[PDB]
Amino acid sequence: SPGLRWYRSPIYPYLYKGRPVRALTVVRKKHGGRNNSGKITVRHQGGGHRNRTRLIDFNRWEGGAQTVQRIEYDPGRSSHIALLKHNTTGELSYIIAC
Amino acid sequence: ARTKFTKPKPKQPVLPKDKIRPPTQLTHHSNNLRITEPIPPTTSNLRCPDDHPLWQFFSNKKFIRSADDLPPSSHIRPWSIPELRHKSFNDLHSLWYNCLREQNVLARENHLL
Amino acid sequence: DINVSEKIYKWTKAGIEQGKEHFKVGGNKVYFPKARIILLRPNAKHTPYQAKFIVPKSFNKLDLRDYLYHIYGLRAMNITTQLLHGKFNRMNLQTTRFREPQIKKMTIEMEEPFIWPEEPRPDENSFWDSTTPDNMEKYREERLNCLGSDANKPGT
Amino acid sequence: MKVNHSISRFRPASWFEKTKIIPPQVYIFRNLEYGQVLYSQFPNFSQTQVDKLFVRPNWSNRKPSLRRDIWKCMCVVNLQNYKQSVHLYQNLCRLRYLRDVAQRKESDKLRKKDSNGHVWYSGQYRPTYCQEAVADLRESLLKVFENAAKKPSIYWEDPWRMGDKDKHWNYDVFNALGLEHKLIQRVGNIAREESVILKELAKLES
Amino acid sequence: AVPKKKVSHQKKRQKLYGPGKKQLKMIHHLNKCPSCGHYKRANTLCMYCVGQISHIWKTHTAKEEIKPRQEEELSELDQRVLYPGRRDTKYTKDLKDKDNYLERRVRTLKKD
Amino acid sequence: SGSYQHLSNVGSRVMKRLGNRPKNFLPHSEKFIKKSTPEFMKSDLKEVDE
Amino acid sequence: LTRPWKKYRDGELFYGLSKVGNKRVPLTTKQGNKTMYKGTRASGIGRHTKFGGYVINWKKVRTYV
Amino acid sequence: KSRGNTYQPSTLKRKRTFGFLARAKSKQGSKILKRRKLKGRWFLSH
RNA sequence: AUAUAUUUAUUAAUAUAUUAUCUAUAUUAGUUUAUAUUUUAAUUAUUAUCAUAGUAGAU
RNA sequence: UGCUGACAUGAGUAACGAAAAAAAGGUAUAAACCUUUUCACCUAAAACAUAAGGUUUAACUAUAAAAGUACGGCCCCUAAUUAAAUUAAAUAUAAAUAUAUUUAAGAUGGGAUAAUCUAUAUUAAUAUUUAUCUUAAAAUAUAUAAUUAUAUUAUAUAUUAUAUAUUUAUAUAAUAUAAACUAAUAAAGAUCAGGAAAAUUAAUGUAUACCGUAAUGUAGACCGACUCAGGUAUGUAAGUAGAGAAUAUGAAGGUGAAUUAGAUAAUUAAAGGGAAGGAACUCGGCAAAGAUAGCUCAUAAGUUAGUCAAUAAAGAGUAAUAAGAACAAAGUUGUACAACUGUUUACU
Ligand SMILES: [Mg+2]
Ligand SMILES: [Mg+2]
Ligand SMILES: [Mg+2]
Ligand SMILES: [Mg+2]
Ligand SMILES: [Mg+2]
Ligand SMILES: [Mg+2]
Ligand SMILES: [Mg+2]
Ligand SMILES: [Mg+2]
Ligand SMILES: [Mg+2]
Ligand SMILES: [Mg+2]
Ligand SMILES: [Mg+2]
Ligand SMILES: [Mg+2]
Ligand SMILES: [Mg+2]
Ligand SMILES: [Mg+2]
Ligand SMILES: [Mg+2]
Ligand SMILES: [Mg+2]
Ligand SMILES: [Mg+2]
Ligand SMILES: [Mg+2]
Ligand SMILES: [Mg+2]
Ligand SMILES: [Mg+2]
Ligand SMILES: [Mg+2]
Ligand SMILES: [Mg+2]
Ligand SMILES: [Mg+2]
Ligand SMILES: [Mg+2]
Ligand SMILES: [Mg+2]
Ligand SMILES: [Mg+2]
Ligand SMILES: [Mg+2]
Ligand SMILES: [Mg+2]
Ligand SMILES: [Mg+2]
Ligand SMILES: [Mg+2]
Ligand SMILES: [Mg+2]
Ligand SMILES: [Mg+2]
Ligand SMILES: [Mg+2]
Ligand SMILES: [Mg+2]
Ligand SMILES: [Mg+2]
Ligand SMILES: [Mg+2]
Ligand SMILES: [Mg+2]
Ligand SMILES: [Mg+2]
Ligand SMILES: [Mg+2]
Ligand SMILES: [Zn+2]
């Protein structure tokens, strides 16, 4: 197809090919770029694919050693995310992948 | 599509005589069966009782009270409030239910009319 | 021990045996009910063991059964409910349209049969004689809807 | 999963003997909406049974709804053997087929017509179908006994539904058998606790 | 395409009634029917006599009405129970009064 | 009739309006009534209000 | 013909007298969606179940003494 | 694309938008209702 | 198979007339088809309808 | 081009809205209504079930029958979203009001049990989208354990015969079509990465409320001023044929209509055929005509390497040689502009 001719995407085979942990995901509510008025404030935003926002830990408070179990695709950000598992505690969390 | 070039399909694969199971049912309906005329249900089998409580909605078992069967306006009066005032509770209750019954009888008739 | 429907059936049988209510009596005691019911003629679809009533629009199926038991002494075993539609009617096209009343009609099944008394002849009963009112109606139709030279046209 | 129930197929005598859910008997069901009748080997039924019977539907004989409330038991007919009951059921189905498809004109001629030449109706209720079913039942039973201990019996919903005990139902074969025309006990909600009543009846003759 | 003026009384009337083509003609070609001595059209059958003959044929060549036995031998009460009366619709009533909208054939005058 | 109107009080406002016709259009109301009624039924005297 | 007595085109409808009329008139039980439930003041009797059933409360049921 | 059929009935929607209770609930709708009452209207809302 | 006639010792055989060539059960849920079982449940002559006048050759 | 009413004129003119009718009888009242027979039309519909809608139009007033299981609402739960509601001082604000947070509402969605028929109450206690291949397994035949060729391969049930609890239960074995289709299962490919919200045992209960149910629904019964060739959601949609829901036919069902009868000039429309010629027509091949398999082969230059070009053109096999259903399939090239699939002036 002529639409395929210029379709490039980087291949990451180590990347996870499963669903994210469901407890760490919230629904990504769409807006269409409309503010509380209901009027288009930000132009050019609309009906994409359905998504879930992932609750990724930016603060990084708890401390202690945590093993990265897997690295995932995240639809709401250009970076990959890494599912950490706390070695002592056993608590599960997402983190921006290095 | 069907065409000049379309060769006919093969016949379906029949199961051999020995391998086929005998059917569970062997003996079917009688061939002698005949369409007889219908038999319409009759009142003769009923024994409708003479004191069926639904007769209480009628008056002397009449489909409709004629002018003569009705109580005339001059002969009849409604109750006076003072008259009612010296009647017992149970009596009043009974009177009320009699009134209601009478209304039902009339209501049936009135509707029909 | 036993299923629910079976228990209900047993209860009903017990109540019948007693000559008490064949059903659980409620607690909301209405001493002076104002509700009337219109016993209707039977349709072709019903049996001699059925009877149908026009009842109040706010009348319950259970309520009806209770009414039949206590007021009249009749025990309705099964009851159905048929709330009718209210078709639009108007006196004339100059007037506002409105619906005729939604009317509730409840069929009952009963353990003894019943057939209505036969409707009277035209000569016998004064009221049950549709010739006169129909004739009057026809005459009214003729006279109001008579326009020009149909005034001379002889009456039907 | 298990898809099929007892009702899901036609069941012959051997199957009944193996199981023994109910005694040897056939159930008959009035349609309160249209007046149509529905035969069945079991006290319940499905869409399959309806499809089997109502094969050539028209405006006069519409394919009935499967809604449970409008169906009510007209008649429960008990017989001397499972095989006999099966045969009766088959005969009834055959008769129905004849009336609808094969010998339809004769059936139509036999029926009651109104003015404007239609089979008499009140609403979409036609009271001829029930009558035919009673006549057809009588015929099928008679055929079964010609083809041919417990005395057989027909538990009626209603005693009125008989055409006349003199004119019909007094064949010599029936008399010899001891065909007892009983009726179902109406000491309860007949429509609502119908299944329970049928179970009780089944228990009674076993 | 469109009339330029209100057409006058004269000009509409001479248009309509002036030409013989547009007028009605006397029916000179009446004559006596030989079967009944009445007016009929020439080279035409008498509608009375042929109607009478058709009626005769109907009365003789009549397919017998099918009365089912079971309905013929019902009791009156039983019949009433089974097949009760009903209110006919306005449309139905209108249909029933055929004499309102159905024209029976008139008889011609007797010829002299 | 085939009415069912008699088992209710439906279209109440309309009925009131019809029932309580203005008195200055009373001749209008009764003209058509008179026409409708046969000779043996109709009376010459005025139907006074309750 | 829809009706045989009317051969020619009068301004009579297929059914009824007038198509038009006052649309603003209270709803009944028959009208509206599948979800539209009017009710007829008949059953403040028991209680609706969590699953969609109903459970009668007999102390709140009308007897006619 | 033929026009004319701009009305496309659906009872629920009508009652939401133009029903009495919708009018009552809003301030603006209440004002409308009042105005209609003042006029003499028989039918205040759908 | 039914109805009407004739023979025979109501039965069977023959003649005429009418109607019928269905149905039901098996092969793991449903539908269709196939075969088997069930039943009396037929294969030749000649027509017709529909498919742009079905298409084509003449006329 | 005054307003309202009444009545003219055009004019007894056009038109009567895609249409197949005939006879006999109801009825010596019927082109139009009902019946019977014949004929035709629709048939992955003009059928049968339904949704929404609506002057109940219906087979009607003696009127559309439900405790629940291939029954819906109501009810529980929430989405989108909504709310003169909610929090000395929630925040902002000429008033109106607006914002944030709570709570409440809100189906188009989720919701236990069931033919062996099933029991919902109270109290107490701690799931985007698509796919089912290959391999492997055993089965059936050819040849000399192993090869070759062919189908079969997870589930759905009755029968018969066994072994254990005791004719009712559990497990095992054997018997048994093809092609579609369903549900439920398992394993899994792609990036565009795929809703929300509402516990379990025990005892005690359960007399089962209300509303919807007619008919109409590719339409005369809704939205289009009309009984309007327009608009209108879903599921079945007999077989024969086929790749198929294409196309032909039509079992059954439904239908043949508020216009008829004749005549068929000129002329118009919508079709069919046409000698000799073959774009000479015309602004322009507009319109019309034109398909020598649709399956299996084969298929170039150029080129961004993509059978892109290609469904290449031509051409072959099967079929057919005088032809003899419908439907799919309608050339090749040069140049200008624009990469491309898309979007646009609802009605030039
Ligand atoms: Mg941008
Ligand atoms: Mg039930
Ligand atoms: Mg509706
Ligand atoms: Mg408009
Ligand atoms: Mg199967
Ligand atoms: Mg045969
Ligand atoms: Mg056709
Ligand atoms: Mg002037
Ligand atoms: Mg003319
Ligand atoms: Mg002209
Ligand atoms: Mg002219
Ligand atoms: Mg003309
Ligand atoms: Mg037309
Ligand atoms: Mg005639
Ligand atoms: Mg098909
Ligand atoms: Mg239709
Ligand atoms: Mg329909
Ligand atoms: Mg419907
Ligand atoms: Mg109900
Ligand atoms: Mg419910
Ligand atoms: Mg809520
Ligand atoms: Mg809600
Ligand atoms: Mg919902
Ligand atoms: Mg229906
Ligand atoms: Mg409309
Ligand atoms: Mg228009
Ligand atoms: Mg139309
Ligand atoms: Mg087609
Ligand atoms: Mg056909
Ligand atoms: Mg030429
Ligand atoms: Mg040539
Ligand atoms: Mg030129
Ligand atoms: Mg030139
Ligand atoms: Mg062209
Ligand atoms: Mg090359
Ligand atoms: Mg083409
Ligand atoms: Mg472009
Ligand atoms: Mg567009
Ligand atoms: Mg445009
Ligand atoms: Zn004569």
Interface touch B103/C36, C-beta < 8 Å: yes
Query: Residue holding tokens 């011609």?
Result: E108
Chain I bases near protein CB atoms (7 A cut-off): 20-27, 29-31, 33-41
Q: Could you write out the DSSP letters of every residue in G20-51?
A: -----S---SSSS-SS-----S---SSEE-TT
Neighboring chain F residues of C127 at a CB cutoff of 8 Å: none
Q: Convert A10-35 into a string of H (helix), E (strand) and C (coil).
A: CCCCCCCCCCCCHHHEEECCCCCCEC
Q: DSSP letters along E39-57, please?
A: EEETTS--HHHHHHHHHHH
Cβ of D56 near strand I (under 7 Å)? The reply is no
Q: Do C9 and D123 touch (CB under 8 A)?
A: no
Residue bearing tokens 């056939």: D26
Helices within D73-190 (DSSP H only) = 82-97, 104-110, 128-147, 172-177
**Sign of the torsion angle spanned by Cα atoms D108, D113, D117, D119:** negative
Residue spans of alpha helices (H) in C19-94: 61-67
Please tell me what resolution, in angstroms, this structure has: 5.0
- B vs D, Cβ pairs < 8 A, gives 85
Buried b (16+ CB within 10 A) or exposed e, B41-62: bbbbbbeeeeeebbbbbbbeee
Amino acid, res. D162: M
CB C143, CB F36: distance < 8 Å:
yes
Q: Which of residues 70-99 of C touch strand J (CB under 7 A)?
A: 80-85, 87-88, 97, 99
D204 touches strand I (CB under 7 A): no
Q: How far apart are CA A27 and CA A25, in angstroms?
A: 7
| Residue D94 CB contacts under 8 Å (≥ 6 apart), including other chains | B29, B30, B33
Query: Phi-psi category of G26—alpha, beta or left, where left has phi over 0 and alpha has psi -120 to 50?
Result: beta
Q: Which residue is nearest to nucleotide J30 (CA to C1')?
A: E102
Contacts of residues G22-30 at CB distance under 8 Å and 24 or more positions apart, as own/partner, are G22/C96, G22/C97, G22/H43, G23/H46, G24/H43, G24/H44, G24/H45, G24/H46, G25/C97, G25/C98, G25/C99, G25/H43, G27/H11, G27/H15, G28/C85, G28/C86, G28/C99, G28/C102, G29/C83, G29/C102, G30/C85, G30/C86, G30/C102
Partner E contacted by C42 (CB < 8 A): yes
H12 touches strand J (CB under 7 A): yes
What is the C-alpha to C-alpha distance for residues D83 and D11, in angstroms, rounded to an integer?
10
Are D7 and D44 in contact, with CB atoms under 8 Å apart?
yes
CB H30 within 8 A of CB H23: yes
- Write the CA distances from C63 to C24, C37, C58, C101, integer angstroms: 11, 12, 10, 21
Of G22, G39, G21, give the one whose Cα is nearest residue G30: G39
| Helix/strand/coil percentages in chain E, nearest 5 | 35, 5, 55
A12 CA vs J134 C1’ separation (Å): 26
Paired strand residues for D71: D31
The B 30-49 residues near strand I by Cβ under 7 Å are 31
Please, which experimental method was used?
Answer: cryo-EM
Separation of alpha carbons E83 and G20, rounded Å: 39
Breaks (C-N over 2.5 A) in chain E follow: none
Tokens matching residue G26 = 């209270």
Question: Whose CA is closest to C98, among D182, F48, G23?
Answer: G23
Contacting residues for D178 by C-beta, under 8 A, at least 6 apart: D151, D152
- Tokens representing C15 are 């109540």
Subunit contact G59:C26, Cβ cutoff 8 A: yes
Q: Which residues pair with D153 in a beta bridge?
A: D78, D180
Distance set, CA D33 to CA C124, D37, D65, H9 (Å): 37, 11, 9, 32
Distance CA D88, CA D139 (A): 10
As beta bridge partners, residue A84 has A68, A93
3-state secondary structure of A85: strand
Measured distance CA(D41)–CA(C49) in Å, rounded:
27
Ligand nearest to the CA of G42: 19
Tokens of F10: 């439906």
Provide the residue type at B103 as one letter. Answer: Q
* Helix, strand, coil content of chain A in percent (nearest 5): 5, 30, 70
Residues of chain B positioned with their CB less than 8 A from the CB of D94: 29-30, 33
Q: How far, in Å, CA of D193 to CA of D181, rounded?
A: 22
Q: Torsions phi, psi of D15, nearest 5?
A: -60, -45
| Whole-number Å distance between alpha carbons of D10 and D90 | 10
Question: Number of helices and strands (H, E) in chain A?
Answer: 0, 5
* Per-residue flag: B20 CB under 7 A of strand I: yes
Question: Structure tokens of G58?
Answer: 């007999």
Please report, as a single letter, which amino acid is at residue G40. Answer: T
**CA-based nearest distance E82→chain B, Å:** 8
Q: What are phi and psi of E9, to 5 degrees?
A: -65, -50
The shortest CB-CB distance from D110 to any of E68, E83, E84 is to E68
As a rounded value in angstroms, the CA-to-C1' distance for A77 and J340 is 30
Q: Is the CB of B21 under 7 A from strand I?
A: yes
Measure the CA–CA gap between H46 and H16, rounded to whole angstroms: 9
Evaluate whether D193 touches B70 at the Cβ level (below 8 Å).
Answer: no
- In this complex, do C36 and B104 lie within 8 Å of one another by their Cβ atoms? yes
Structure tokens at B43: 């009142």
CA count, 13 A, side-chain hemisphere, E66 = 16
Written as one letter, the residue type at C38 is I
Distance of alpha carbon D179 from alpha carbon D156, whole angstroms: 13
For residues B17 and B25, give the distance between their C-alpha atoms in angstroms, rounded to a whole number: 18
Name the phi and psi angles at F32, rounded to 5.
Answer: -70, -35
Report whether A29 contacts A43 (CB < 8 A).
no
How far is C73 from C66, CA to CA, in rounded Å?
10
Closest CA to D73 of D133, D28, D37: D28
- Cβ of G58 near strand J (distance < 7 A): yes
